Design a protein around this ligand. Sequence first.
Ligand SMILES: *[C@@H]1O[C@H](CO)[C@@H](O)[C@H](O)[C@H]1NC(C)=O
Lengths: 49, 26
Amino acid sequence: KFLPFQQFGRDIADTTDAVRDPQTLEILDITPCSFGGVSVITPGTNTSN
Amino acid sequence: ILPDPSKPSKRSPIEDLLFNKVTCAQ
Ligand SMILES: *[C@@H]1O[C@H](CO)[C@@H](O)[C@H](O)[C@H]1NC(C)=O
Protein backbone atom coordinates (compact mmCIF):
# COMPACT_ATOMS: atom_id res chain seq x y z
CA LYS A 1 0.00 0.00 0.00
CA PHE A 2 2.22 2.75 -1.38
CA LEU A 3 1.25 6.37 -1.89
CA PRO A 4 0.42 6.86 -5.60
CA PHE A 5 2.68 9.89 -6.08
CA GLN A 6 5.61 8.18 -4.33
CA GLN A 7 8.18 6.18 -6.27
CA PHE A 8 9.93 3.34 -4.44
CA GLY A 9 10.79 1.79 -1.10
CA ARG A 10 13.82 0.27 0.59
CA ASP A 11 14.74 -1.73 3.70
CA ILE A 12 17.69 -2.30 6.03
CA ALA A 13 21.23 -1.82 4.64
CA ASP A 14 19.84 -0.14 1.50
CA THR A 15 18.16 -3.41 0.47
CA THR A 16 15.68 -1.66 -1.81
CA ASP A 17 12.66 -3.88 -2.50
CA ALA A 18 10.52 -1.85 -4.91
CA VAL A 19 10.53 -0.46 -8.45
CA ARG A 20 7.94 1.05 -10.79
CA ASP A 21 7.87 1.20 -14.59
CA PRO A 22 7.37 4.79 -15.82
CA GLN A 23 5.15 3.69 -18.73
CA THR A 24 3.08 1.03 -16.93
CA LEU A 25 2.10 1.46 -13.28
CA GLU A 26 2.74 -1.64 -11.17
CA ILE A 27 4.36 -2.66 -7.88
CA LEU A 28 7.14 -5.25 -7.64
CA ASP A 29 9.57 -6.71 -5.11
CA ILE A 30 12.99 -8.36 -5.26
CA THR A 31 14.76 -11.12 -3.34
CA PRO A 32 18.54 -11.56 -3.63
CA CYS A 33 19.94 -14.51 -5.52
CA SER A 34 20.25 -17.90 -3.87
CA PHE A 35 23.79 -18.55 -2.66
CA GLY A 36 25.79 -20.57 -0.19
CA GLY A 37 28.86 -22.54 0.77
CA VAL A 38 29.44 -25.94 -0.81
CA SER A 39 30.99 -28.52 1.51
CA VAL A 40 32.41 -31.92 0.60
CA ILE A 41 31.89 -35.16 2.54
CA THR A 42 34.72 -37.63 2.00
CA PRO A 43 36.10 -40.67 3.80
CA GLY A 44 39.84 -41.11 4.21
CA THR A 45 41.46 -40.34 0.86
CA ASN A 46 43.44 -43.58 1.11
CA THR A 47 40.25 -45.58 1.70
CA SER A 48 38.43 -44.16 -1.34
CA ASN A 49 38.44 -41.23 -3.75
CA ILE B 1 7.82 -34.90 33.93
CA LEU B 2 7.98 -37.77 31.37
CA PRO B 3 7.21 -37.40 27.65
CA ASP B 4 3.55 -37.21 26.67
CA PRO B 5 2.70 -39.78 23.96
CA SER B 6 -0.49 -37.96 22.95
CA LYS B 7 1.25 -34.83 21.65
CA PRO B 8 2.86 -35.14 18.19
CA SER B 9 6.04 -33.65 19.67
CA LYS B 10 7.48 -36.24 22.07
CA ARG B 11 8.11 -33.82 24.93
CA SER B 12 6.99 -33.31 28.52
CA PRO B 13 4.60 -30.58 29.70
CA ILE B 14 7.47 -28.81 31.47
CA GLU B 15 9.46 -29.08 28.24
CA ASP B 16 6.47 -27.64 26.37
CA LEU B 17 6.31 -24.65 28.71
CA LEU B 18 10.08 -24.19 28.41
CA PHE B 19 9.88 -24.20 24.61
CA ASN B 20 6.95 -21.77 24.54
CA LYS B 21 8.30 -19.33 27.14
CA VAL B 22 11.55 -18.37 25.37
CA THR B 23 11.57 -17.11 21.78
CA CYS B 24 14.20 -11.10 9.14
CA ALA B 25 15.99 -10.18 5.90
CA GLN B 26 19.45 -9.99 7.51
C1 LIG C 1 46.20 -44.24 4.36
O1 LIG C 1 46.61 -45.50 3.80
C2 LIG C 1 48.00 -45.54 3.43
C3 LIG C 1 48.23 -46.87 2.77
O2 LIG C 1 47.82 -46.85 1.41
C4 LIG C 1 48.86 -45.32 4.67
O3 LIG C 1 50.23 -45.28 4.28
C5 LIG C 1 48.48 -44.02 5.36
O4 LIG C 1 49.20 -43.89 6.59
C6 LIG C 1 46.98 -43.98 5.64
N1 LIG C 1 46.61 -42.71 6.24
C7 LIG C 1 45.91 -42.61 7.37
C8 LIG C 1 45.61 -41.22 7.84
O5 LIG C 1 45.55 -43.60 8.00
